[PDB]
Design a protein around this motif. Structure first.
Motif, PDB file in Angstrom:
ATOM      1  N   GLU A 184      52.983  49.248  52.845  1.00 21.51           N
ATOM      2  CA  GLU A 184      51.528  49.338  52.667  1.00 21.51           C
ATOM      3  C   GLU A 184      51.107  50.763  52.283  1.00 21.51           C
ATOM      4  OE1 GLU A 184      48.703  48.246  55.978  1.00 21.51           O
ATOM      5  OE2 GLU A 184      48.023  46.803  54.485  1.00 21.51           O
ATOM      6  N   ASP A 185      50.496  50.910  51.107  1.00 20.79           N
ATOM      7  CA  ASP A 185      50.032  52.186  50.575  1.00 20.79           C
ATOM      8  C   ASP A 185      51.151  53.188  50.281  1.00 20.79           C
ATOM      9  OD1 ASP A 185      47.387  51.241  50.642  1.00 20.79           O
ATOM     10  OD2 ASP A 185      47.079  51.994  52.669  1.00 20.79           O
ATOM     11  N   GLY A 186      52.392  52.699  50.172  1.00 21.41           N
ATOM     12  CA  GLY A 186      53.501  53.511  49.686  1.00 21.41           C
ATOM     13  C   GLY A 186      53.812  54.725  50.538  1.00 21.41           C
ATOM     14  N   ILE A 187      54.400  55.734  49.909  1.00 20.79           N
ATOM     15  CA  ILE A 187      54.704  56.972  50.610  1.00 20.79           C
ATOM     16  C   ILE A 187      53.419  57.670  51.091  1.00 20.79           C
ATOM     17  CG2 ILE A 187      54.903  58.476  48.577  1.00 20.79           C
ATOM     18  CD1 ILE A 187      57.224  59.898  50.035  1.00 20.79           C
ATOM     19  N   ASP A 188      52.320  57.515  50.350  1.00 20.64           N
ATOM     20  CA  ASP A 188      51.035  58.053  50.809  1.00 20.64           C
ATOM     21  C   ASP A 188      50.644  57.468  52.160  1.00 20.64           C
ATOM     22  OD1 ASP A 188      50.974  59.512  48.435  1.00 20.64           O
ATOM     23  OD2 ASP A 188      49.357  58.339  47.566  1.00 20.64           O
ATOM     24  N   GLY A 189      50.832  56.160  52.326  1.00 27.79           N
ATOM     25  CA  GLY A 189      50.584  55.484  53.605  1.00 27.79           C
ATOM     26  C   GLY A 189      51.513  55.947  54.708  1.00 27.79           C
ATOM     27  N   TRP A 190      52.790  56.096  54.367  1.00 30.75           N
ATOM     28  CA  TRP A 190      53.793  56.626  55.294  1.00 30.75           C
ATOM     29  C   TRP A 190      53.377  58.013  55.835  1.00 30.75           C
ATOM     30  CZ3 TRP A 190      58.483  54.353  56.843  1.00 30.75           C
ATOM     31  CH2 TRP A 190      59.425  55.203  57.431  1.00 30.75           C
ATOM     32  N   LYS A 191      52.952  58.895  54.929  1.00 29.04           N
ATOM     33  CA  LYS A 191      52.468  60.229  55.309  1.00 29.04           C
ATOM     34  C   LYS A 191      51.230  60.140  56.208  1.00 29.04           C
ATOM     35  CE  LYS A 191      52.328  63.159  51.707  1.00 29.04           C
ATOM     36  NZ  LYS A 191      51.998  63.388  50.265  1.00 29.04           N
TER      37      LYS A 191
ATOM     38  N   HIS B 241      59.022  50.571  48.150  1.00 28.67           N
ATOM     39  CA  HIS B 241      57.820  51.405  48.133  1.00 28.67           C
ATOM     40  C   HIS B 241      57.680  52.184  46.857  1.00 28.67           C
ATOM     41  CE1 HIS B 241      58.741  55.748  48.529  1.00 28.67           C
ATOM     42  NE2 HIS B 241      59.813  55.387  49.210  1.00 28.67           N
ATOM     43  N   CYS B 242      56.439  52.542  46.560  1.00 25.39           N
ATOM     44  CA  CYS B 242      56.090  53.449  45.462  1.00 25.39           C
ATOM     45  C   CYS B 242      55.212  54.561  45.998  1.00 25.39           C
ATOM     46  CB  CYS B 242      55.332  52.693  44.396  1.00 25.39           C
ATOM     47  SG  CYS B 242      54.030  51.841  45.211  1.00 25.39           S
ATOM     48  N   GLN B 243      54.328  55.108  45.155  1.00 26.49           N
ATOM     49  CA  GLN B 243      53.508  56.214  45.564  1.00 26.49           C
ATOM     50  C   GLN B 243      52.388  55.824  46.511  1.00 26.49           C
ATOM     51  OE1 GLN B 243      54.384  59.482  44.579  1.00 26.49           O
ATOM     52  NE2 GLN B 243      53.065  59.909  46.348  1.00 26.49           N
ATOM     53  N   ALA B 244      51.537  54.901  46.073  1.00 26.29           N
ATOM     54  CA  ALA B 244      50.323  54.546  46.825  1.00 26.29           C
ATOM     55  C   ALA B 244      50.070  53.039  46.939  1.00 26.29           C
ATOM     56  CB  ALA B 244      49.118  55.241  46.198  1.00 26.29           C
ATOM     57  N   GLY B 245      51.117  52.228  46.811  1.00 24.17           N
ATOM     58  CA  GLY B 245      50.985  50.763  46.835  1.00 24.17           C
ATOM     59  C   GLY B 245      50.646  50.021  45.538  1.00 24.17           C
ATOM     60  N   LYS B 246      50.345  50.731  44.439  1.00 25.60           N
ATOM     61  CA  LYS B 246      49.972  50.081  43.147  1.00 25.60           C
ATOM     62  C   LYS B 246      51.148  49.503  42.324  1.00 25.60           C
ATOM     63  CE  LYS B 246      47.578  53.588  41.502  1.00 25.60           C
ATOM     64  NZ  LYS B 246      47.859  54.434  42.699  1.00 25.60           N
TER      65      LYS B 246
END
Length: 103
Positions: A87-94, A60-65
């Motif tokens: 999917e959508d990184g840590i932003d998605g996780w949140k 994972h990364c920040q937002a999937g990019k």
């Protein structure tokens, strides 16, 4: 292949590694408790260390990019594991209501 935060949780409960490819400063500000940090630049230089290898690896990364755009690098770095991108990184996780650790 992308994986939802809730589906990733189920794999992590079965031993899958969740690997945060962001930098240490980003991780220290906010991260997923179950994740292991391994910045992409380090992985590109020296590879995935043995301690982070498993049958299933989720990056994972920040937002999937960063995972989307470095899909080919990541597929090699974790080969021959079954590999997923969160999917959508840590932003998605949140957004899914799963816990993070904030400084």
């Amino acid at each position: 292949t992308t994986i939802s935060p809730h589906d990733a949780q189920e794999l992590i409960a079965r031993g899958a590694k969740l690997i945060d490819i962001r930098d240490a400063d980003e991780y220290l500000r906010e991260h997923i408790p179950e994740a292991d940090l391994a910045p992409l630049s380090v992985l590109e230089q020296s590879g995935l260390p043995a301690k982070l290898r498993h049958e299933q690896i989720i990056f994972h990364c920040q937002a999937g990019k960063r995972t989307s755009n470095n899909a080919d690098k990541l597929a090699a770095i974790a080969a021959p594991a079954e590999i997923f991108l969160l999917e959508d990184g840590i932003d998605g996780w949140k957004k899914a209501g799963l816990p993070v650790a904030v400084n």
